Amino acid sequence: NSPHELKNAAQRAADWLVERQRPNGALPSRTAVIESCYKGMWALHTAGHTQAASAVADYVTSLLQPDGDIPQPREERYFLDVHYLYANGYLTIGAHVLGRFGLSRKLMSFVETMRNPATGGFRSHGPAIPGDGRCDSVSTSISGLAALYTGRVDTARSAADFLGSLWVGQPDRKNVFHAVADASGAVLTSDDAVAVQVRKAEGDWYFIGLPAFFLTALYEATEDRAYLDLATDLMTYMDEDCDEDAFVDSSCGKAGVAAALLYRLTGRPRYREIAEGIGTLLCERQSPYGYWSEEETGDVADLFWGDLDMTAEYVLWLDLIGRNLASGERVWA
Amino acid sequence: GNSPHELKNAAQRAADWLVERQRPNGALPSRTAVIESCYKGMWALHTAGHTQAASAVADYVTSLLQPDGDIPQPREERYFLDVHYLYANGYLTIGAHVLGRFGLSRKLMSFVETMRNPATGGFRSHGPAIPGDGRCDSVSTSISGLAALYTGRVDTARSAADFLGSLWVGQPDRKNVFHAVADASGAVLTSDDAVAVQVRKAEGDWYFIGLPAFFLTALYEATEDRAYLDLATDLMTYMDEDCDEDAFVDSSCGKAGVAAALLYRLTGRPRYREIAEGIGTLLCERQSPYGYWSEEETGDVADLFWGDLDMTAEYVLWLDLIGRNLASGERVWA
Ligand SMILES: *[C@@H](O)[C@H](NC(C)=O)[C@@H](O)[C@H]1O[C@H](O[C@H]2[C@H](O)[C@@H](O)[C@H](N)C[C@@H]2N)[C@H](N)C[C@@H]1O
Numbered sequence A: 001n002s003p004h005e006l007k008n009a010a011q012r013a014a015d016w017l018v019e020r021q022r023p024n025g026a027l028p029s030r031t032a033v034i035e036s037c038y039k040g041m042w043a044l045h046t047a048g049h050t051q052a053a054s055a056v057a058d059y060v061t062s063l064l065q066p067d068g069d070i071p072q073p074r075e076e077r078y079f080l081d082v083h084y085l086y087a088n089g090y091l092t093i094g095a096h097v098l099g100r101f102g103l104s105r106k107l108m109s110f111v112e113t114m115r116n117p118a119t120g121g122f123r124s125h126g127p128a129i130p131g132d133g134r135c136d137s138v139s140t141s142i143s144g145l146a147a148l149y150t151g152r153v154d155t156a157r158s159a160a161d162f163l164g165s166l167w168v169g170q171p172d173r174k175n176v177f178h179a180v181a182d183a184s185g186a187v188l189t190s191d192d193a194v195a196v197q198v199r200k201a202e203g204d205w206y207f208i209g210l211p212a213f214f215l216t217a218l219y220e221a222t223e224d225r226a227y228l229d230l231a232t233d234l235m236t237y238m239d240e241d242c243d244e245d246a247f248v249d250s251s252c253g254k255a256g257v258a259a260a261l262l263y264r265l266t267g268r269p270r271y272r273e274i275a276e277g278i279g280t281l282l283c284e285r286q287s288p289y290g291y292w293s294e295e296e297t298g299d300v301a302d303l304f305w306g307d308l309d310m311t312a313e314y315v316l317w318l319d320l321i322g323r324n325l326a327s328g329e330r331v332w333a
Numbered sequence B: 001g002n003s004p005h006e007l008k009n010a011a012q013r014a015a016d017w018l019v020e021r022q023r024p025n026g027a028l029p030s031r032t033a034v035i036e037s038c039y040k041g042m043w044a045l046h047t048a049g050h051t052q053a054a055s056a057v058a059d060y061v062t063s064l065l066q067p068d069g070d071i072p073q074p075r076e077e078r079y080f081l082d083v084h085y086l087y088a089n090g091y092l093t094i095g096a097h098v099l100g101r102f103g104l105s106r107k108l109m110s111f112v113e114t115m116r117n118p119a120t121g122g123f124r125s126h127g128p129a130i131p132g133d134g135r136c137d138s139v140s141t142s143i144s145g146l147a148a149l150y151t152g153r154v155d156t157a158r159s160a161a162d163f164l165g166s167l168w169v170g171q172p173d174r175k176n177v178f179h180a181v182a183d184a185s186g187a188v189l190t191s192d193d194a195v196a197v198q199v200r201k202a203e204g205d206w207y208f209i210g211l212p213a214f215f216l217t218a219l220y221e222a223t224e225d226r227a228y229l230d231l232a233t234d235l236m237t238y239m240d241e242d243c244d245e246d247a248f249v250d251s252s253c254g255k256a257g258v259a260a261a262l263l264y265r266l267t268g269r270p271r272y273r274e275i276a277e278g279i280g281t282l283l284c285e286r287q288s289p290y291g292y293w294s295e296e297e298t299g300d301v302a303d304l305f306w307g308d309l310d311m312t313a314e315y316v317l318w319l320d321l322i323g324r325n326l327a328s329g330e331r332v333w334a
Helices: A003-019 A040-046 A050-065 A085-099 A101-113 A137-150 A153-168 A206-222 A225-241 A250-266 A270-285 A305-332 B006-022 B041-047 B051-064 B084-096 B102-116 B138-151 B153-168 B207-223 B226-242 B252-267 B270-286 B306-333
Strands: A175-180 A195-197 B178-179 B194-200
Touching: A003 A040, A003 A153, A003 A270, A003 B051, A040 A050, A040 A085, A040 A175, A040 A305, A050 A101, A050 B306, A085 A101, A101 A137, A137 A153, A137 A206, A137 A270, A137 B306, A153 A206, A153 A225, A195 A270, A206 A250, A206 B102, A225 A270, A250 A270, A250 A305, A270 A305, A270 B084, A305 B051, A305 B207, A305 B306, B006 B041, B006 B051, B006 B306, B041 B051, B041 B084, B041 B306, B051 B084, B051 B102, B084 B102, B084 B138, B102 B138, B138 B153, B138 B207, B153 B207, B153 B226, B207 B226, B207 B252, B226 B252, B226 B270, B252 B270, B252 B306, B270 B306
Parallel strands: none
Antiparallel strands: A175 A195, B178 B194
C-alpha cells in the first residue's frame, strides 16, 4: 500500500471510534478502563478529530488525581506491574499536542517522580502496586518520548542512557531480550522479568520496537549519532537476529514507525521496505467496518479493551508510517 | 450561531481545498513563493488530519532552513521584515513541534530565542538582515511565547508575559490608541512608524491585542498563575467594552475568538462563549463556496494571493480551536 492508502485506513478507523464515542468522551470499550483509551487523544488528533480528542481529554481530566497520576480505572496487569507508565506516556503526549498544557504538565511531572535518577529508567510498577524498583524498556521509552513532546530533553537523554545500558548489558541477545533492569541499573534476568524470546514467534516485540522508535525521534531532536546508532542496532537486531514474527505480530507497529522515520532520516531502502511491509499488513487486517480486532468480525457497537486500544494504536502508527514514507520519498527521490 | 461541528466542517473543506492544490515540493498554492504564504500550514493541516500534507510543508520549510535556524528568505511583505519578523517563525515552530519534527522545531525555536530581549522579555520586531532600533512588539512576543509553551520553554513564555504586562500597564492613552510596540528598554513607542491600533475606529490590526490574549490564556492554562489570567481578562474586557465593534468583526478577529473560546472552557464565563460563537459563525459565513477564504477573490482559482492563502490556513486553525474549546466548554460548564 502507498502512504495515502495507509492514511485512508487510519481515517476509517478514527471515524469508527468517533461515531461510537460516549457523551463524557470515553471511547466504546466493554470495560471502563484507562488501558482502553490512553492512545485516544493523540490518535484522534492525528486524524483531525480534534473535538473527539478534546472530549477524551475532558474524560481524562476528570480522572486526574492531585499527584498527576491516573491510578484508576486499571485492570490489566501489564498496566499495573509490567509497564504502569505506558498509559501515562500516551496521555501526556496527547494532552500536549492538543495544547492542554496544564494536563500535560501535571501528567509529565508525575511520570518524572517514577524516574530512577541514577539509571535514567522509569519504574515498572505504579504507586499502589508493591515492587522492587525494577525499570523496563517500555516504561522508559514512552516516558522519554513524552519528555520529547513536552520539551524535557534532559529527561529524554537520560531515558536513552538507560536504554543503551540495557542493550549493552544483555547476557544472551541471540536468544532472549531481557527488557528489565534492577534499581541499580543491571539487567534483570530473573524468571519474573519481561523477556522476549527472540527466536520464537511469541510476541512482545514492542519491548524492542518502542525503544527503536523513541531513540530515532531523539536522534531527530538532537542529531547525536549515538542515538541513531542504537536505534539502527535495534532495527538490525529485529530484522536479522529475531524471528520473522517481529515484523508480523500485532506489536510490530512500533518497529514499523521506527523504520519509516529511519527511512526519512537516512534514506536507506531497507527501512522503507520494513515500514511498507508492516503498514500493508496492518492495513490488510483492518475490519471492513473500520476497527481492528483479534477475534471479532462484523458490525459491533463496542470492543473489548485490547481491541479498542489496538484500533487507536493503528490509527497512530499508520498515520506516522504514512507521513514518514511520503516525506522520505520526497526527500530521497 | 453555528455549532462546533459546523465550524469544524468549514475548516475541513478549506483544508481539503489547500491539499488538493499543494505543490509536489510541499509548498502551498501561493501566487508568490514567500514564507508568509504558508507559515501556518504545518499546524493548520495537522489540526485537520492532513498529516502527509503537513509533513510536506515541513519538508518545504526544512529546505529553506538556514544554519542559524532562521528562514530569512523568501520574504517580501514589510510586516514580516520589520513589524513582526518572528510571526512566521512562531507558527513554523509550533507546527513542526506538534508534528514531531523535533530537529526542525528545536532549530527554529533556538533562533527565536536569539531575538529575545533579556532585559524586558520582549522579542525584536526586525530580523537579523533588517536594520532596526531593537523595538519589540506584542505580536512577535506573544507568538514567540506561544511557541515557547509548545516546545516546553516555559521560563521564556513567562518572560514574554512580563513584557506584555509592561506594555499594557504603560499605555499612555488606551481609550483612544493601543500602541503595540515598545523600545528596547520597554517604554511604549508612540512614533508614527510604530504599530498603533486606533481602538475607536474600524481599521483592523486587532490581532496586536487578540494574540496576546490568546497566548496569556494558554500560559494560564499551563501554569495556573492567575496573573496571566487577569491580564488576558483585562485585554478581552478592553476589546469588548473600549474598542470598536470591529474588534470582533475584522479579518484579524480570529485571535480574540480563539482566546474567548479557551477562556470559556477554562472559566465558564458566558460572555466568552458568546464572543467565540459570534466570531466562529462570522468566519464560517465568509467562506467561499469552493473552500478558500478571501475578501476579494470569487472564482474557482488554482492559487491565491499570499495573504489569502495565509488567511485560509489561519481560519482552518481558528475554526478548529474555537470549535474544540466551545464543545469541551459546553461539556464542562453547561
Ligand atoms: C504495544 O502498544 C502493544 N500493542 C499491540 C497492538 O500489540 C500493547 O498495547 C499491548 O501489548 C501487550 O499485549 C500484546 C502482545 O505484545 C502481542 O505480542 C500479542 N500478539 C497481542 C497482545 N495484545 C500487552 N500485554 C498489552 C498491551 O495492550
